[PDB]
Design a protein around this ligand. Sequence first.
Ligand SMILES: *[C@@H]1O[C@H](CO)[C@@H](O[C@@H]2O[C@H](CO)[C@@H](O[C@@H]3O[C@H](CO[C@H]4O[C@H](CO)[C@@H](O)[C@H](O)[C@@H]4O)[C@@H](O)[C@H](O[C@H]4O[C@H](CO)[C@@H](O)[C@H](O)[C@@H]4O[C@H]4O[C@H](CO)[C@@H](O)[C@H](O)[C@@H]4O)[C@@H]3O)[C@H](O)[C@H]2NC(C)=O)[C@H](O)[C@H]1NC(C)=O
Ligand SMILES: *[C@@H]1O[C@H](CO)[C@@H](O[C@@H]2O[C@H](CO)[C@@H](O)[C@H](O)[C@H]2NC(C)=O)[C@H](O)[C@H]1NC(C)=O
Ligand SMILES: *[C@@H]1O[C@H](CO)[C@@H](O[C@@H]2O[C@H](CO)[C@@H](O)[C@H](O)[C@H]2NC(C)=O)[C@H](O)[C@H]1NC(C)=O
Lengths: 122, 109, 423, 352
Amino acid sequence: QVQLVESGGGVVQPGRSLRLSCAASGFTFSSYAMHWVRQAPGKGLEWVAVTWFDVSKKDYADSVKGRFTISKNTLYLQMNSLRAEDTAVYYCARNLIRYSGSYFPVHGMDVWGQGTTVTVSS
Amino acid sequence: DIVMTQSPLSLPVTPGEPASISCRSSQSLLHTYGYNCLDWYLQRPGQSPQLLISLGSYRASGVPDRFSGSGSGTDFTLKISRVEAEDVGVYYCMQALHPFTFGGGTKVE
Amino acid sequence: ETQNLNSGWTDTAHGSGVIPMRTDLELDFSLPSSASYTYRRQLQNPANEQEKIPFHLQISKQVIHAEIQHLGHWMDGTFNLKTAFHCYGSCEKYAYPWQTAGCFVEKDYEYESGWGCNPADCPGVGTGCTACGVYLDKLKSVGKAFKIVSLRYTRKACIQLGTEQTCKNVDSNDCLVTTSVKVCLIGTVSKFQPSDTLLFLGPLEQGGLIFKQWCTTTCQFGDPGDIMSTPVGMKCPELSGSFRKKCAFATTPVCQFDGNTISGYKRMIATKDSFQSFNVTEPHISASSLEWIDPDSSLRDHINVIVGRDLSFQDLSETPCQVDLTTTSIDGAWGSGVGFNLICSVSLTECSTFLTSIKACDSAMCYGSTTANLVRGQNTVHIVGKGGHSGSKFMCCHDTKCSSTGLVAAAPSDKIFDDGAPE
Amino acid sequence: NLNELKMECPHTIGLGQGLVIGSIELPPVPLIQVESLKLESSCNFDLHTSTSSQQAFTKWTWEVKSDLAENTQASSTSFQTKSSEVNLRGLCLVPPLVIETAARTRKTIACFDLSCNQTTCQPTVFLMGPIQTCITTKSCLLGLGDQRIQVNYEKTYCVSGQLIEGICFNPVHTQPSHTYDIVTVMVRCFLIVKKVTTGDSMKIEKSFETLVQKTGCTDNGFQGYYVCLIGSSSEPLYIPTLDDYRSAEVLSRMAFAPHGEDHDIEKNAISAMRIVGKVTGKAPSTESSDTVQGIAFSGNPLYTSTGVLTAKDDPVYVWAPGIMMEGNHSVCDKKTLPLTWTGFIPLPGEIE
Ligand SMILES: *[C@@H]1O[C@H](CO)[C@@H](O[C@@H]2O[C@H](CO)[C@@H](O[C@@H]3O[C@H](CO[C@H]4O[C@H](CO)[C@@H](O)[C@H](O)[C@@H]4O)[C@@H](O)[C@H](O[C@H]4O[C@H](CO)[C@@H](O)[C@H](O)[C@@H]4O[C@H]4O[C@H](CO)[C@@H](O)[C@H](O)[C@@H]4O)[C@@H]3O)[C@H](O)[C@H]2NC(C)=O)[C@H](O)[C@H]1NC(C)=O
Ligand SMILES: *[C@@H]1O[C@H](CO)[C@@H](O[C@@H]2O[C@H](CO)[C@@H](O)[C@H](O)[C@H]2NC(C)=O)[C@H](O)[C@H]1NC(C)=O
Ligand SMILES: *[C@@H]1O[C@H](CO)[C@@H](O[C@@H]2O[C@H](CO)[C@@H](O)[C@H](O)[C@H]2NC(C)=O)[C@H](O)[C@H]1NC(C)=O
């Protein structure tokens, strides 16, 4: 079957470091784009980053650009200089895209991970 | 800039009636390829988000016929006929291209 | 001075050359390969002229030894072009039967919107990768290839001096040195060179082809040796060329290829007359060397022979080998056309063995000769000749001793013979 | 329209041994007409009728979803697959010992296999019999659907080996030496179902998993073997035979080319197709879970579309038009074995 499992979540102080991981299985990692979507406590949904066309192109959100880097068939997310406003549950999702360097979806994020929790407040 | 606006932040209703959710964008979501780059997601209380509609009106696989997507340009709408008990959760529209901005949430109960 | 002998028989009259050993008997001559040499003289002591010793020099055919590297089997192939458009996602690797081919090269094309080439048989709008590939199918072995590391040329030298006999292989660096006779192979000219590649389309004794340019480091489809089947596995060439993404019927994406589509074996077959071929006789191959006899006079040797002046005539003429000849049978007919065969019972005495030659004369001239190693007792020798006229009773002659009986015939090689008889 | 099936016979018939075999590709027929196909004989030999009986196949097809919105982009869920049982008649389903003893029983086997895409099937007719039928029959006319097949028996050189520079070389009969004159001969193999009560000796799929060095598979319960014929005339070959070098080489070629040669119509020579995607199915269709997988495609008919599941010893026959069934021996689950297999085998050779 296909599924996504997250790990590496924890709780640290502002300015430190943390790295999340997303192990994929059941589908080709070069045919689907891989997204990171977080959800602050009691708040809505916020897109974080994405990688597509195997792992040669990457994009990030403005609020995080330059601080996170999206790197076994597993997906990583290095969270450096994690300031205190990134407190959220981070999800791992896939979606099908046209086979090109230009990101364009064929359908939305169909299968998600169970999510991992990371809170930074001191 | 670009932001998404969702109507009723809360949509309480009984089981077995129609329901409507609107989602309005700052700029046009109609792509040159001819697709509205907007998705519809649902998050149950203890569950991760799930896919309902992709690219404006294309019903996702495994989603029953009661859900329906429509709209063009900037004014999009999510129709659900005969609301069931399983439909409880928060609804989110999402832009399908980079600026991936979310609607903000619409609660149903 | 050297003397370039050639193979063939020459009609000679009766006689046998006698050489009085006042000086060292020196022979300098060059003979072609695949040509056996027979030099026969009677060596006579200047003092006591009744001391005559037989000298028979028999030089066998040239065998050529080549240190070789086994390169494996050359392989023919079929150029097959295939295009696979994925309706979604990436192009899968080793997921389809055509990717089981012996060797292949694929190119992955991105989906470009606005190209217009959208097939109508995908379940929707196809947006996946286009996998274009060249696949070499139906690989067959067409022969073995060997690379020449080094070359060495030997000739078997057999000598009958008086009552003594010996046979020894001689090459360039190992001259035969006896107390009385020295046989030196001084040089050898060859059609084969080191680093040459020998290709054998069939068995060893069926011939071969010589390749000066055989693929090694950079191997391309169409080169001599492009596809090789080695013990470690399949060694494959680069498929020189490029892919071009085309559109057929404004619907289905199809790829085309600009470059060579003819295998190296097929391009060799179309130009086979341009490759040096060579015939092979009595081949012997190991894991490190190849041994054969060229039968096409492609090789030429240069031999030097020295017979010492001070022969031990007294010890070499103790019990001289005595042979007796009786003419018994004759096959074939006469004349210069059909040729004949002469059966003769030869009986040697005293000696255990004796290397000599029996000749086929008539009343005036000899038309053929046969050299053989006589074993003590009775010997049956067959002689092939050509010639004769009414009343020419064919008989067998050892030097000048001919059988008393003579047989007439009916109505209508690559050897060298030199017994000193008058022409 | 008619098609000439040529039976390339050896010149030595009275002193000959083994069988003579031939095959021919027929024009494609639509999918609806497949179940009513009957192979008619009218020949002058002794036809074995076992293959002319009905057998249940799990017809496994794919198609685009009928309720597909306009401009819907292709995905893994934009199409569906389905399966149902259907009776097929005339396919190459030879009982054991039939081909092996055909020389003694003097019987002739005639059948066909199917290579299909989404809408049509191309039949490949096989005909094999005793060497002596090259004289007693000589000429005949088979029939299948709307097609007739002119059968000609003609004496042919090097029917069992390969021509090297004009001289025939046959495979070595046994292997004492090392590496020498290699010939490349065509083999046509046929799957045989044969169960035994206790041992693992008939689990041929375990031999393939050994050759590809795949450990831990347990879905290899099928019991059977293959009967191969070399060239156009030879004695039947049992696969696998543990002391026959030909058997080990034929088995090795199957392990690394499970679908064997294609039955392509190389006219036009434009090899282009569309890969719909990886699919799974229920075989039999009354199963509660998926039992077979493969690759759905769109294009001209290329490879065989018939096989058996390697999981069940009770043979589960699958007819998957438009789907290349999973044949890679390195997987453990949902793999299949083909009904017919054509390949080219490199073997040590010797002159006739
Ligand atoms: C069932 O499913 C499995 C799993 O999907 C599948 O396994 C795959 O098998 C293929 C071969 O059948 C494997 O691919 C081979 O990989 C080796 C190793 O690749 C690395 O190393 C080489 C250098 O050693 C690098 O060049 C390469 O980029 C990798 O880093 C390759 O060596 C193989 O290439 C040779 O064979 C090709 C034909 O398959 C030739 O086209 C190619 O030119 C290569 O030829 C070689 O020839 C000389 C020999 O030394 C050499 O001098 C040349 O330079 C050249 O290297 C080949 O790519 C693949 O990894 C497996 N995938 C897995 C295990 O996940 C089965 O194939 C499949 N079976 C069936 C029947 O469907
Ligand atoms: C190898 O031997 C063959 C003969 O066995 C040579 O080919 C013949 O050459 C003669 C001489 O001109 C021709 O009359 C024949 O027609 C040729 N063919 C045959 C089949 O006899 C061949 O030339 C030899 N190879 C080399 C390199 O000399
Ligand atoms: C499946 O194979 C059949 C047979 O080749 C294809 O049908 C042929 O299509 C060509 C061109 O459209 C016609 O000229 C032939 O007359 C057709 N033959 C038959 C028997 O119908 C068919 O197109 C293939 N399926 C797909 C999806 O390509």
